[PDB]
């Protein structure tokens, strides 16, 4: 287990802890603004995942 | 403009912010690494709309 492995472990806690964080706000807004969240944060994700692509 | 739209704004100012933040630290760490946390943000949306779809 080398230290970059907990970094990496420690981002993917953060992420899972922030998703139920935002779960509990989106509750808070009318369907269509959670539609419209959610679909940032799914095109936001494959946007980090193309330009993670990109920089190798 | 009202209250809760303002709040569904900021939102989407905070994830845009993140998610520029998430792309600095990814750099960081290896492919793979990079490829496990992408898949974990993208599946990770993807239950939040079905969540928000459910609690309908």
């Known amino acids: 287990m ?3 492995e907990k970094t990496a472990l420690n ?5 899972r ?6 779960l509990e706000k989106l509750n ?8 419209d969240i959610c679909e940032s944060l799914h095109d936001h994700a494959d946007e980090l995942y193309r330009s993670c ?3 190798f």
Chains 1, 2 share one sequence.
């Open 28 to 35: 808070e807004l009318d369907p269509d603004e959670q539609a």
């Open 2 to 4: 080398t230290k970059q």
């Open 53 to 55: 692509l990109a920089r």
């Open 17 to 22: 802890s922030q998703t139920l964080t935002l």
């Open 11 to 15: 981002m993917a806690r953060f992420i």
